[PDB]
């Protein structure tokens, strides 16, 4: 501060940020190359948001495209946060009390908390002043941070794809604000004698983001257009017949019952929702159409398919035999055996797993679909609860005609529910390749800790204890990951888990089914499952003291 | 007002998920304050309404928990395990035993909801209401 | 009332749990005691005789009977209806 | 005939509970 | 006001030429300028003055076998100012 101005030794040290200028140069070169190859149009601008001369936590890159609507300028911005590992932000301190002693907890600050209302206000004012329009309206298009520990010198493809996607998002938000024809399933008939088919898939390698961020995905549900006519030409050649893709994985939760209902309940978590690669448009009415595919995974209990053991290898991280540790027998059920097969795998699932699953979503305010995750988070609960629900109902009505009131009543029925759970987002480098941090779940922790139930119970309470403070839960979760996974964990963000309403999913599915949407797709005896429906409730009908005392009332 | 209550256990006839035993609460005495010298029928129902309030925090199960230091062995709750899956009795008065698994025992062997009963007496102090209820 | 070693107590202290504690493992005797209370087939006089014998067997020789009482069960819906009616009638009671 | 238990006590059971008086950070939204 | 923050480390400190330096305890001095309506949330202006790297070592006094057998000696390795101060 004033010490440097008080002594004034010749020469300058530090006092600069070097992960912004290089990124700006790279982005300018990429934009020039893309414009040269007739890939984009010279109608957008790239600007730098320096932290030094704006006094903000993190520098950012903003991509602004402006149009004119009825004489009123409109500017759309897609900020890109640029976290740096060379500087440390001050931590947040919290105090908790235990008996007669008080202590201080040093938390950590994520990217999400940096992007506050004041940050966006300063960014909008800076953009308005730079572009020469002081009173122009500014609309957000969805932030997307660039993860640290990424070398920009050899990552040109990811940056190029991110820039094109950002331009597409700006165009999408501008078109939505201007007002265009909504996307409806009535226009999907094609009037050419084709049908829509849904294909399920079981995967073992994680999916990848546009910047190489791994995403856990065990079950993948896709929707395609099947146009197989009689003498179909183009053998072995396919014309982009694919529309949607949803990545899902199942997790087990244990209900608190002391020891006929199964002890464990299976909950399915939706991680990523996206459209086809060929489709360059993203509109709100496609999101619900893509999300409707999640419910179709229960057609043949396909959510249990990843649980069955694979033949030849055993990673011992997702083993299902650990479920027997707390069963009636203390030991674990031994898979990988000649006798073990699907014959009693179904018996085990019937006797220890509830038949019906639970649907959950990992909403993220900083992901690719931030503009919908934020809306759903607002609809879950807060000051803006009625407006978000009304907007969602209006969008669902716009997708597929109307008359959604016959199946759902948003006035007296919650849409989304918040479970009060915060999930860290990170990646750990396995021996073979980089993986996702969310691979560690209840089953993984149970496998890691063979017989010590108390440690596992402590881990389980470290996730959803309502009494314990959230900072302590985050500390315990960060310690357990280090204990089990390894030393290569690198956190990147935060996410929140929410539970959909049970009736909402069924109502949405029935509404889409009734709206003219038709989707087609795809042993030892155990007993009579239909004899129990017919049972006599009544009993055969055949003809076949009380001493009292004085009462003043009567 | 003042209402005196005590709980008793009844066993449903089921051969061997529902708990085997059901807790029934018996109301013995209902009375007003000592200072109040008036007794009217409409005060009796107002006083009796306090009986239902004992289930606000499962307060009817509080006397069941073991006391520290003494054991009369007349109201011991460990005898409930005699007919359980294990023949022997659960041993209280131990260092490991506490409220941590007392709740587990009550969940696994006692129905969550109680039953309300009254011991009407035609010759007691409140005879004029006991006779009417009889 | 039966006179305990310290002070006089109440005869109703003997309940199902007390009988179960007194008879450690013999289930048949306890079941006989339980049937001596609410068997509908058996005559009431025999039930009173068995109950008077069991009290002498367990409690002591100081039992002194004074009267009779009858047990009744309130309707489940009646209590809830009464509570809701009083609550809606402007009565507010607060506690832990 | 031997007694087995009370088959009528389970019909009367209280369903309710005694009635006594006794964050959400947000961000910018383009929709509103 | 001036505040001193203690720190426990496990990775060695580095010299200006990459030479590692052992440092288990780090003591720093900062300027705390938190006023009422402080602006610049999440932004800090170089509030740090000094830094001292220390680590402890045990020495045994020569007594044959109430005083403890071992005595702890703290060794100061590096003393330096803040990066901003030139």
Author numbering:
A (entry chain D): 48 to 306, 319 to 581, 590 to 611, 622 to 631
B (entry chain A): 291 to 306, 319 to 436
C (entry chain A): 486 to 581
D (entry chain G): 590 to 611, 622 to 631
E (entry chain M): 242 to 306, 319 to 339
Sentences from the paper on this structure:
Size-exclusion chromatography coupled to multi-angle light scattering (SEC–MALS) of purified chimallin indicated a mixture of oligomeric states including monomers, well-defined assemblies of approximately 1.2 MDa, and larger heterogeneous species ranging from 4 to 13 MDa (mean of 6.9 MDa). Cryo-ET of the largest species revealed pleomorphic, closed compartments with near-identical morphology to the phage nuclear shell that we observe in situ. Analysis of the smaller, more defined assemblies by cryo-ET revealed a near-homogeneous population of cubic assemblies with a diameter of around 22 nm, and a minor population of rectangular assemblies with dimensions of approximately 22 × 33.5 nm. Two-dimensional class averages revealed that each cubic particle consists of six chimallin tetramers (24 protomers, 1.67 MDa) arranged to form a minimal closed compartment with apparent octahedral (O, 432) symmetry. Three-dimensional reconstruction of the cubic particles with enforced O symmetry resulted in an approximately 4.4 Å-resolution density map with distorted features, probably arising from the inherent plasticity of these assemblies breaking symmetry. Using the maps for the tetrameric face and full cubic assembly, we built models for the higher-order chimallin oligomers to understand the subunit interconnectivity. CTS1 extends from one protomer to a neighbouring protomer positioned anticlockwise around the three-fold symmetry axis of the cube, and CTS2 further extends anticlockwise to the third subunit around the same axis. Although the linkers between the C-terminal domain and CTS1 (residues 582–589) and between CTS1 and CTS2 (residues 612–621) are unresolved in our maps, we could confidently infer the path of each protomer’s C terminus within the cubic assembly. Compared with the tightly packed chimallin tetramers mediated by the well-ordered NTS region, the length and flexibility of the linkers between the chimallin C-terminal domain, CTS1 and CTS2 suggest that flexible inter-tetramer packing enables chimallin to assemble into structures ranging from a flat sheet to the observed cubic assembly.
In response, one family of large bacteriophages uses a nucleus-like compartment to protect its replicating genomes by excluding host defence factors. Here we find that the bacteriophage nuclear shell assembles primarily from one protein, which we name chimallin (ChmA). Combining cryo-electron tomography of nuclear shells in bacteriophage-infected cells and cryo-electron microscopy of a minimal chimallin compartment in vitro, we show that chimallin self-assembles as a flexible sheet into closed micrometre-scale compartments. We find that the shell is primarily composed of a single protein, chimallin, which self-assembles through its extended N and C termini into a closed compartment.
